[PDB]
Design an enzyme around this catalytic site. Sequence first.
Site, PDB file in Angstrom:
ATOM      1  N   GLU A  28       0.861  -1.185   0.000  1.00 52.80           N
ATOM      2  CA  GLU A  28       0.000   0.000   0.000  1.00 52.80           C
ATOM      3  C   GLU A  28       0.901   1.239   0.000  1.00 52.80           C
ATOM      4  OE1 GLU A  28      -2.892   0.032   3.092  1.00 52.80           O
ATOM      5  OE2 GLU A  28      -4.135   1.578   2.151  1.00 52.80           O
ATOM      6  N   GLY A  29       1.355   1.616  -1.193  1.00 52.25           N
ATOM      7  CA  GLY A  29       2.139   2.818  -1.380  1.00 52.25           C
ATOM      8  C   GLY A  29       1.269   4.023  -1.681  1.00 52.25           C
ATOM      9  N   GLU A  30       1.938   5.137  -1.993  1.00 51.14           N
ATOM     10  CA  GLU A  30       1.220   6.337  -2.406  1.00 51.14           C
ATOM     11  C   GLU A  30       0.506   6.150  -3.738  1.00 51.14           C
ATOM     12  N   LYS A  33      -3.416   0.765  -3.133  1.00 57.54           N
ATOM     13  CA  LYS A  33      -3.405  -0.536  -2.478  1.00 57.54           C
ATOM     14  C   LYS A  33      -3.464  -1.646  -3.520  1.00 57.54           C
ATOM     15  CE  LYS A  33      -5.918  -2.974   1.164  1.00 57.54           C
ATOM     16  NZ  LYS A  33      -7.218  -3.006   1.891  1.00 57.54           N
ATOM     17  N   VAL A  34      -2.526  -2.586  -3.435  1.00 64.96           N
ATOM     18  CA  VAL A  34      -2.468  -3.734  -4.332  1.00 64.96           C
ATOM     19  C   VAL A  34      -2.605  -4.998  -3.494  1.00 64.96           C
ATOM     20  CG1 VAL A  34      -1.121  -4.973  -6.055  1.00 64.96           C
ATOM     21  CG2 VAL A  34      -1.028  -2.475  -5.957  1.00 64.96           C
ATOM     22  N   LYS A  54      -4.846  -3.602  -8.168  1.00 64.64           N
ATOM     23  CA  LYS A  54      -4.586  -2.289  -7.598  1.00 64.64           C
ATOM     24  C   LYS A  54      -5.907  -1.566  -7.352  1.00 64.64           C
ATOM     25  CE  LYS A  54      -1.201   1.424  -8.047  1.00 64.64           C
ATOM     26  NZ  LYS A  54      -1.926   2.585  -8.631  1.00 64.64           N
ATOM     27  N   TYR A 102       0.065 -10.970 -12.029  1.00 60.19           N
ATOM     28  CA  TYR A 102       0.556 -11.214 -10.676  1.00 60.19           C
ATOM     29  C   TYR A 102       2.030 -11.603 -10.741  1.00 60.19           C
ATOM     30  CZ  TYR A 102       1.270 -13.574  -6.189  1.00 60.19           C
ATOM     31  OH  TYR A 102       1.762 -13.980  -4.970  1.00 60.19           O
ATOM     32  N   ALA A 103       2.899 -10.691 -10.306  1.00 56.93           N
ATOM     33  CA  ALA A 103       4.346 -10.911 -10.279  1.00 56.93           C
ATOM     34  C   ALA A 103       4.744 -11.233  -8.840  1.00 56.93           C
ATOM     35  CB  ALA A 103       5.083  -9.691 -10.819  1.00 56.93           C
ATOM     36  N   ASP A 149       9.219   7.934 -13.952  1.00 59.68           N
ATOM     37  CA  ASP A 149       9.698   7.503 -12.641  1.00 59.68           C
ATOM     38  C   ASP A 149      10.859   6.520 -12.766  1.00 59.68           C
ATOM     39  OD1 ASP A 149       8.249   4.708 -12.722  1.00 59.68           O
ATOM     40  OD2 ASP A 149       6.673   6.183 -13.122  1.00 59.68           O
ATOM     41  N   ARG A 153      12.190   0.445  -7.318  1.00 61.40           N
ATOM     42  CA  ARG A 153      10.916   0.260  -6.628  1.00 61.40           C
ATOM     43  C   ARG A 153       9.796  -0.055  -7.612  1.00 61.40           C
ATOM     44  NH1 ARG A 153      13.910   3.780  -3.812  1.00 61.40           N
ATOM     45  NH2 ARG A 153      13.839   3.774  -1.524  1.00 61.40           N
ATOM     46  N   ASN A 154       9.704   0.713  -8.699  1.00 59.80           N
ATOM     47  CA  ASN A 154       8.590   0.590  -9.630  1.00 59.80           C
ATOM     48  C   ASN A 154       8.690  -0.629 -10.540  1.00 59.80           C
ATOM     49  OD1 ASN A 154       9.515   3.953  -9.950  1.00 59.80           O
ATOM     50  ND2 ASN A 154       7.829   3.278  -8.629  1.00 59.80           N
ATOM     51  N   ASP A 167       3.965   0.724 -12.556  1.00 61.35           N
ATOM     52  CA  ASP A 167       3.767   2.072 -12.017  1.00 61.35           C
ATOM     53  C   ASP A 167       3.769   3.122 -13.132  1.00 61.35           C
ATOM     54  OD1 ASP A 167       3.278   1.697  -9.261  1.00 61.35           O
ATOM     55  OD2 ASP A 167       5.415   1.378  -8.877  1.00 61.35           O
TER      56      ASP A 167
HETATM   57  C1  LIG Z   1       5.955   2.033  -0.777  1.00 58.23           C
HETATM   58  C2  LIG Z   1       6.740   1.296  -1.837  1.00 58.23           C
HETATM   59  O1  LIG Z   1       7.763   1.788  -2.315  1.00 58.23           O
HETATM   60  N1  LIG Z   1       6.283   0.054  -2.285  1.00 58.23           N
HETATM   61  C3  LIG Z   1       6.973  -0.746  -3.305  1.00 58.23           C
HETATM   62  C4  LIG Z   1       6.018  -1.310  -4.335  1.00 58.23           C
HETATM   63  N2  LIG Z   1       4.924  -2.056  -3.701  1.00 58.23           N
HETATM   64  C5  LIG Z   1       4.077  -2.683  -4.728  1.00 58.23           C
HETATM   65  C6  LIG Z   1       2.905  -3.627  -4.320  1.00 58.23           C
HETATM   66  C7  LIG Z   1       3.618  -4.813  -5.030  1.00 58.23           C
HETATM   67  N3  LIG Z   1       2.892  -5.199  -6.207  1.00 58.23           N
HETATM   68  C8  LIG Z   1       2.287  -4.286  -7.054  1.00 58.23           C
HETATM   69  C9  LIG Z   1       1.748  -4.908  -8.128  1.00 58.23           C
HETATM   70  C10 LIG Z   1       1.046  -4.138  -9.125  1.00 58.23           C
HETATM   71  C11 LIG Z   1      -0.132  -4.599  -9.698  1.00 58.23           C
HETATM   72  C12 LIG Z   1      -0.826  -3.762 -10.562  1.00 58.23           C
HETATM   73  C13 LIG Z   1      -0.331  -2.498 -10.835  1.00 58.23           C
HETATM   74 CL1  LIG Z   1      -1.226  -1.469 -11.889  1.00 58.23          CL
HETATM   75  C14 LIG Z   1       0.864  -2.026 -10.277  1.00 58.23           C
HETATM   76  N4  LIG Z   1       1.339  -0.770 -10.559  1.00 58.23           N
HETATM   77  C15 LIG Z   1       1.553  -2.880  -9.409  1.00 58.23           C
HETATM   78  C16 LIG Z   1       2.013  -6.314  -7.992  1.00 58.23           C
HETATM   79  C17 LIG Z   1       1.766  -7.509  -8.715  1.00 58.23           C
HETATM   80  N5  LIG Z   1       1.149  -7.503  -9.933  1.00 58.23           N
HETATM   81  N6  LIG Z   1       2.178  -8.725  -8.218  1.00 58.23           N
HETATM   82  C18 LIG Z   1       2.834  -8.703  -7.016  1.00 58.23           C
HETATM   83  N7  LIG Z   1       3.161  -7.663  -6.222  1.00 58.23           N
HETATM   84  C19 LIG Z   1       2.730  -6.469  -6.753  1.00 58.23           C
HETATM   85  C20 LIG Z   1       4.777  -3.876  -5.442  1.00 58.23           C
HETATM   86  C21 LIG Z   1       4.156  -1.146  -2.845  1.00 58.23           C
HETATM   87  C22 LIG Z   1       5.027  -0.539  -1.765  1.00 58.23           C
HETATM   88 CL   LIG Z   2       2.669  -0.014  -6.449  1.00 56.66          CL
END
Ligand SMILES: CC(=O)N1CCN([C@H]2C[C@H](n3cc(-c4ccc(Cl)c(N)c4)c4c(N)ncnc43)C2)CC1
Ligand SMILES: [Cl-]
Length: 287
Positions: A28-30, A33-34, A54, A102-103, A149, A153-154, A167
């Site tokens: 749950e970043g800015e 929520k994912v 997300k 789903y990664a 960006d 992280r992204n 992202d």
């Molecule tokens: C505060 C901070 O720097 N953080 C680092 C990144 N964190 C993300 C959640 C995790 N995440 C995200 C996604 C995901 C899914 C759909 C979309 Cl559209 C996007 N943009 C991402 C995802 C995934 N498909 N499968 C497994 N994990 C996943 C990486 C949040 C906290």
């Molecule tokens: Cl994210």
Amino acid sequence: SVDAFKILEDPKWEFPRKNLVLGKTLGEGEFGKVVKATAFHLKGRAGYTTVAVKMLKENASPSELRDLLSEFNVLKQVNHPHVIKLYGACSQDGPLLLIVEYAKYGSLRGFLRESRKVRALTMGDLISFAWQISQGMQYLAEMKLVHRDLAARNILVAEGRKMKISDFGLSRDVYEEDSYVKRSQGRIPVKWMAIESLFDHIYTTQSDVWSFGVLLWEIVTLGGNPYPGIPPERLFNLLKTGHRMERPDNCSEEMYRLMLQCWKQEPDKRPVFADISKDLEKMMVKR
Ligand SMILES: CC(=O)N1CCN([C@H]2C[C@H](n3cc(-c4ccc(Cl)c(N)c4)c4c(N)ncnc43)C2)CC1
Ligand SMILES: [Cl-]
């Protein structure tokens, strides 16, 4: 007119919220929520498929929705193996949910940080990661699109340790489209910002090469934080005076040379992702 809240419905991408079971929060970043989920009867056939959704946070601001929708339309256009695949969405008559690939292995920075205390990551693994992301950015530049960006992280990591660029909220077109676009000011982390972005607010595709140069640093340092200790003003002066980041601990001499090529003062003289992908393959084929 219509307040930004009201979202338009795309018929191809709309998925039934009834055919979706949400689950454990993955972060749950800015951005938002994912959570982890699996969707039944997704894209025609035929069973269930584990995905990631997300969504807006409980305390979401209008800009968060504006960027989440700006993330939607970019995911619609792009389809690439090393770019996280948009599988569906849930917009009308309910909370906005983006059903995405789903990664499992998570954020690339989290993948690199976990490994150095523990899995064993060879140096050949890292050049493969940068070579994977170079291809994905190469694809985005062939869409004439800026990602802006681009950081460790992204970037996401999928099953089998495969990279997936994510992202896309802050993405912009290299050649503008909307006759009146509201510019999202100063949202990029200053350390990943190209000198011209700091100077004249210009976020080009050659600026994302600068971003990729910082990203390379993050990979070889295994999650390392760039420019440690330096405040914002001192960084701007440092890049203006000419200094960059020094050769990291246990980094290849020809790999660090590439990083400086991305931090060149003139963006015109910066390698393009298509010509970078060849530089990274040449590094592996020696080993
Ligand atoms: C505060 C901070 O720097 N953080 C680092 C990144 N964190 C993300 C959640 C995790 N995440 C995200 C996604 C995901 C899914 C759909 C979309 Cl559209 C996007 N943009 C991402 C995802 C995934 N498909 N499968 C497994 N994990 C996943 C990486 C949040 C906290
Ligand atoms: Cl994210």
